[PDB]
Amino acid sequence: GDTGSLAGLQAMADKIREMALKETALSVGAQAGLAWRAKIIDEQLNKQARNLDAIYDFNSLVLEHNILPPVLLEGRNTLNLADAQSIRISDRTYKVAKQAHFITTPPTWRQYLWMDYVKPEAPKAEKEIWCIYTERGWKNGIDQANTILEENIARIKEDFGGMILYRKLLAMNMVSPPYVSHTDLGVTGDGSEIHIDDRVLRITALPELNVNSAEWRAAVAKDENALERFQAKIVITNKSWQPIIAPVS
Amino acid sequence: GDTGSLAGLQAMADKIREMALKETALSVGAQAGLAWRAKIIDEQLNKQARNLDAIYDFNSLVLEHNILPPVLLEGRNTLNLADAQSIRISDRTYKVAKQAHFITTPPTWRQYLWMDYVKPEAPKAEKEIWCIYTERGWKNGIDQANTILEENIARIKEDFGGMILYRKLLAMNMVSPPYVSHTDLGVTGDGSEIHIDDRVLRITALPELNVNSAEWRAAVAKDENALERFQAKIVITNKSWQPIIAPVS
Amino acid sequence: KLPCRVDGACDATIIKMMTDLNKKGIKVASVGQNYLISIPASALFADQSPRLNWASYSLLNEIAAFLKQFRKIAITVTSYSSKYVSVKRERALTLARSRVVSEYLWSQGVDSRIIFTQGLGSDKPITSYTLGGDRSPNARVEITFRRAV
Amino acid sequence: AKVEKVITPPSKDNTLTIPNAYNLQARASVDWSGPIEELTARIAKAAHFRFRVLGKSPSVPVLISISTKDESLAEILRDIDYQAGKKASIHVYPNSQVVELRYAKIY
Amino acid sequence: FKKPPINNPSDDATIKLAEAAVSVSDSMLEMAKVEKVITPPSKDNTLTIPNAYNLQARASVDWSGPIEELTARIAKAAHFRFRVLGKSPSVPVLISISTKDESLAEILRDIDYQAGKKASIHVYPNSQVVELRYAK
Amino acid sequence: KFKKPPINNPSDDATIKLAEAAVSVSDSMLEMAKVEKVITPPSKDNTLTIPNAYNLQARASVDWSGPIEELTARIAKAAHFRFRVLGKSPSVPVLISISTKDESLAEILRDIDYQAGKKASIHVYPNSQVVELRYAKIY
Amino acid sequence: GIPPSANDLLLHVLEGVPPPGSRRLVVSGGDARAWLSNEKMYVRTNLTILSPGWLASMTSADGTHAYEMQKSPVLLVSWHGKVMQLKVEGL
Amino acid sequence: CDLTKFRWDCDLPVQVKPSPASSLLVYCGSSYGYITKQQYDILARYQRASVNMVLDINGEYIDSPCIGAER
Amino acid sequence: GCCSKMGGINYCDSSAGRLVCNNGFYSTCYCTRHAVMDLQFLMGCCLWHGGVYPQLNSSGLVVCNDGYVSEECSLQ
């Protein structure tokens, strides 16, 4: 007897009635399978906790004043068939899904990817097809947990990619940096309470995509050839590794 | 026991009562026969799927700006007997059944010719003529499926032929081409969302049959004879293949 | 309610037919997803001619079944042969052989969008033993492809 | 087809824009019903020609469907160019071994 | 023993269907052949690869914006000077190049093609200069 | 028999999805790094501010995900360098996360300085044997 | 006036995030994901949709399409020059 | 080159500058050199044969793929 | 089983949707519903018309989501 394993769930029990049996078996199987798959997903995430920390390093993308950069969404080849006789096309659209804000701690991958787990304590056409339908429900719950994890991954990827895209656009002068001003009060207070070095930080200008296309700055990378390098026996050599299955198309 | 075959339908059971038996047998047979014939029609369409794609190639008829050409219907030798002492005759009539519009994907033959298939589950003057009348209903359902497929073929033929007729009439200058205008906005948007290359396509003029008969262009084909060609032993020879059943009229 | 495997293909079947072709003498190798079927031209054609023997059609049928066991986008049928008369001669002969094998394989409908054909004549041998005609080791037909997904 | 050819006969053959050459005479039997660019890239790769693309690919794809059997890659590229028509154009430069697909300047 | 094609039309109606498909495809090809307008290579108004050594260098560009900035950056990467002849339009000439491995000469060819008749690009290798010629 | 070389242990679809997302993130990071480097290439190396010396060539394998100051102090103590701090430590900690394996203490200090960036800066004076961490003059 | 640019939810669909306040659909037979939000269908896929016909589209950097269309229980797609179908359930 | 033997081993010197004699481009990966007309022809022959033609300098591999370019 | 005459099922590769067997060879068997299947025969009413409109039927008519009525599914 165990709800944390399909074996124990099956061993628990070792047209209207048939349909009710199928429905209840699917219902009990789905929740147990979803919980077990969430547990295994959490185990995998904790196994790769340091790698996930290296990958989704929100701390390195944080701006100067501990400001979370905005999330920028990009789409290309945009088309909208408004109706017959009217379409609207655009080469690229950039959008600010989330705006920059002051933060006190960088976000972590656990806020996105963690999968909530609680062990669910719960209980011919009577306990013969019940096993087959509870196995079907277990598979359905596993699939549901996988879909939830996939959505969580998509969300964290969207956020991290938006911050990276903001950094790239700021490099290319397609967004303005957040402008923050400090008001520097002296020693502030009265005889009951004083604050020594009182400073008030305020984002006076949020980052925003600039429409002055003249101000943008393109970046062209390059790859290094034999320029300025070259006994200098520059030779195109046949003697080399040759693939076994050569003409694959 | 099977609803997907007439053999299974008949094996299922191996004046008022007589009439009720006939009616119910016809009703059960018709649906099963129609479903089975729809399945076989779909199998044949999928067998000839590539040939159907070659024939009904709506993609090759698509106009410049991804515009579906209008469907033109043609009739000849028109006569209408309005009443006694009044008829109206006309040599040819051309009509625009459907007008041109922007499209995003070319139409396919499946939208017209596909036959919906769902396996229909269902159950002396008692089970003796029941098989005879269920066979009659099976034949009736097969005929109904064939008629539905015939109507679908007629519809796809009308649409494809109307598009081809539009192309022909445009060649002979009996229709005007659709006129599309592009409004070319620059970089459009504000600090929250920008679009790089904003263009608005609008069909400012729909195609229409022009009544200026002076502007039409006739086309006369020809067949090549021995002109400008011809030891040159031009000869009418008896020695050749001769039909066995020669004077057939 | 949904197919459990690609229709008409089995892993035991693939292994059995690879073993059988290798036993016969047709080299069926697989490095990664890339598959190679090397066929000696002596088992397909006549002596330096692009005319298959009627007996070789059973071998071509087995190779067609093998190709049908996989899902793919493009096969490549290449022909190499020993030097007989002239560079143009073996080039034309190998192109014709590739055309004919490709036509038969295409007719025995395989799940292949493209079947490229080519013959380089005597450009890329696989053995230093060039003695012989069509019995030579490097007079062969290569059917190379990549399993799709 | 007859009436349109009579109305305006063609004047130029696309063999000028796609001049055949060696290794473009390799043959292929194709059955394709997708976007133009992938098929052209596969043809160019099998012809050992570098594939180059000009112009912005439109949002509405340039779908082509070639169902042939054993014709040379030059003929297949000519067929692809004709089927593309006003949407896309295929050129072949055999001196530089370049197959170039360019999307027309519509939009 | 040779086997017949599995997809062989061996039905009285399938054969006719297949020949009708063949004729439809042939007629469509003929119609496309008549329809198509081609530009002969001699009369092609596009930049021909300038062959300049500095311009043959490979690059990786992901740009969607004004032509002027990308052309200037490409010229500077190629070490050529850059100049503009003409008056910049009100609405800027917007282009997009998204390539991972393409030479600067080919990128300039693509830029010229996408500019079309709003602007053109000339390359002088002897006096290494990229010129963006606007149109009026 | 027929086999192909890499017969690894079974993988989970959780790890598979994480691997795909990680590869996409890595590609985005590569593109961003390349475009920023082209936009403005670096001009100065932090080896000027952290000059290596003897006993800074001691090697360490670190796995740290905390504030900068404690790791810097441990590195300095293991290098036998007196640790000094300049500037007011901000309320929001300068968190660093260094996960390396056996590189010299000078290299670790360089990595820490680069990770700190605009928040904190590490200097090393080998004449006075001083490792000095200074919190920037923001706020 | 000026028609709408496109649906901003297509950016979230591109990223793989379901549009807010939507329900999942079960796409079988290929690599695609579908969500139903406002009696419309949003599909993330690497394939090309041919038959059903979409209302709006966006393309991501690496070549992933986000389609906004009307709901349809079948999607005709071209995988690699091959026309197959994806069965959309949950409509 | 010797194109048939068994291993088709051969050698093609590369001239970096676009000399009048050797002005035909070869893109060895990201590193490009210039060769002659006969050299381009035989390299294209090897490309048709689908043989890897990695670029070697002083016996050291630099870049794998060779593809002919504008003449 | 699926990977028969190979070693056996190693694991389901969800990135490709197929099984990977104990030898390096993939498996013809699918393991996720998102594996590329050559689905060409799809059951169901009102295909290519938006699917069946979810209304409580007063007659046997099956009406699709675009208004077209499916005569092949309607009651007779």
Side-chain angles (χ1 to χ4, degrees), chain H:
Chain H
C1 299
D2 206 80
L3 185 269
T4 308
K5 45 171 314 307
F6 140 75
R7 203 36 167 66
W8 351 285
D9 41 37
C10 94
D11 216 272
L12 276 89
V14 177
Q15 310 188 348
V16 305
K17 268 293 102 163
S19 47
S22 323
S23 35
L24 310 200
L25 266 156
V26 172
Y27 273 92
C28 311
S30 305
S31 56
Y32 53 94
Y34 293 54
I35 54 160
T36 61
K37 299 242 191 33
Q38 155 182 331
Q39 281 170 330
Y40 189 156
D41 289 351
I42 184 136
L43 200 183
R45 175 145 100 114
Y46 269 94
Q47 227 185 326
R48 272 179 248 119
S50 73
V51 164
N52 199 1
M53 287 285 282
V54 305
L55 152 73
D56 290 354
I57 293 165
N58 294 320
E60 266 218 44
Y61 158 94
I62 266 55
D63 263 336
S64 102
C66 286
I67 297 172
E70 268 208 342
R71 293 206 193 187

Side-chain angles (χ1 to χ4, degrees), chain A residues 243-249, chain C residues 31 34 36 74 76 116 144:
Chain A
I244 304 107
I245 300 92
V248 164
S249 188
Chain C
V31 162
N34 293 353
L36 172 93
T76 323
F116 294 106
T144 65

Side-chain angles (χ1 to χ4, degrees), chain B residues 212-228:
Chain B
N212 294 13
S213 38
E215 305 178 356
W216 301 347
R217 245 210 65 107
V220 175
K222 283 165 62 180
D223 302 321
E224 287 293 11
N225 79 284
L227 187 41
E228 314 285 357

